[PDB]
Ligand binder design. Structure first.
Ligand SMILES: *[C@@H]1O[C@H](CO)[C@@H](O[C@@H]2O[C@H](CO)[C@@H](O[C@@H]3O[C@H](CO)[C@@H](O)[C@H](O[C@H]4O[C@H](CO)[C@@H](O)[C@H](O)[C@@H]4O)[C@@H]3O)[C@H](O)[C@H]2NC(C)=O)[C@H](O)[C@H]1NC(C)=O
Ligand SMILES: *[C@@H]1O[C@H](CO)[C@@H](O[C@@H]2O[C@H](CO)[C@@H](O)[C@H](O)[C@H]2NC(C)=O)[C@H](O)[C@H]1NC(C)=O
Ligand code: NAG
Lengths: 47, 42
């Protein structure tokens, strides 16, 4: 499912949890906050 | 074909998207289909 372009949610405001198009990773503000908070080790990339 | 999981040899790479048939890794899956190579050749 995809949220509609117009965010007319009766005064409720979900900007900080919905995806942020600008970021290369389509993650919300809080998701980015969490990802930066956790200092992951041993990512397991191609290396 | 080069993939985030490693080197994949012997599988043609398409740019469509289907359901994961045989999971490989890093979002890449493999499947057995006609997929051109034609319309019946598998
Ligand atoms: C839903 O809630 C979020 C809460 O973040 C809101 O997004 C932004 O929140 C801030 C703070 O409430 C709004 O005010 C900003 O305040 C900071 C300082 O604290 C200023 O630096 C901002 O100035 C500029 O930057 C903003 C973002 O780039 C611009 O929107 C703003 O016009 C200025 O250019 C700003 O004054 C901020 O206005 C909102 N908006 C944005 C886009 O950040 C969000 O707006 C709420 N949802 C709706 C529909 O309003
Ligand atoms: C071996 O893996 C490394 C990445 O870990 C790559 O090697 C280089 O890739 C870039 C181009 O993408 C260039 O620097 C060179 O073509 C490659 N060699 C060197 C010394 O940089 C690449 O994925 C693999 N090696 C090759 C030749 O493709
Ligand atoms: C697949 O993606 C686009 C067409 O959808 C094209 O630019 C690209 O070359 C294609 N790659 C292969 C291996 O077919």
């Amino acid at each position: 499912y995809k949220t509609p372009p117009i965010k007319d949610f009766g005064g409720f405001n979900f900007s900080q949890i919905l995806p942020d198009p600008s970021k290369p990773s389509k993650r919300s503000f809080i998701e980015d906050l969490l990802f930066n908070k956790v200092t992951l080790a041993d990512a397991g990339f191609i290396k | 074909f080069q993939t985030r999981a490693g080197c994949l040899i012997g599988a043609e790479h398409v740019n469509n998207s289907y359901e994961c048939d045989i999971p490989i890794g890093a979002g890449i899956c493999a499947s057995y289909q006609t997929q051109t190579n034609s319309v019946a050749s598998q």
